[PDB]
Amino acid sequence: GAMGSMERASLIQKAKLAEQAERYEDMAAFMKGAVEKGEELSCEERNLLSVAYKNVVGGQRAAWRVLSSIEQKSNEEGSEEKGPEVREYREKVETELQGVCDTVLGLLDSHLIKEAGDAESRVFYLKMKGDYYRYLAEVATGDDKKRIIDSARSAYQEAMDISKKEMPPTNPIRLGLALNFSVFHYEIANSPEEAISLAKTTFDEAMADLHTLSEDSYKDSTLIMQLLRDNLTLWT
């Protein structure tokens, strides 16, 4: 909307500047503007989009967890009543978080995903779709909790199916997708065995393909493999 008058190239340039300045809200707005120009995004541009919103929602999630913990403590036995302020402020942060998720999901639905034909782009966007439904799921408590969870699962599953067909087992997008879908199983779907199985199988299949990679590709793949191992260690 407000970025309608700025050149696409200028928005991209400014997103990169905002990243350098750790101005992630600005970075997200610039990339939102870029997406709304209607052209497909390059790999670098998709990274700017994801980095920006990851940082924004990351901060909101951290704040929501702080406030939720305080709220939970206030509802324990022996806690002397403090009024509606804790709930109200947790709700405020929660609503802002949901707004950011809805914004990202909106961009994916209008029209990033439908125009993404290459495996690398389509999987990247579907992973994002899974991730932002997962963030919605983390705060969901009502009649829509189950549908939100299934929306996350559905997006992750479509991404997994394409990634298995079209990309090598060491592909960083394939690896990152599996990492996050594994976390979905553990943290959202109450399926810790599925989480562990997915992380293990992904790790082992990547290990067997490392021999094919250059030094630079090896670096990115092994970094994510270490995250899979970290989670497995956390869970076993």
Binding site: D131, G176, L179, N180, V183, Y186, E187, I224, L227, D230, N231, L234, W235
Partner: peptide, 5 residues
């Protein structure tokens, strides 16, 4: 919390 990317 577990690692995601």
């Amino acid at each position: 919390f577990p690692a995601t990317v």
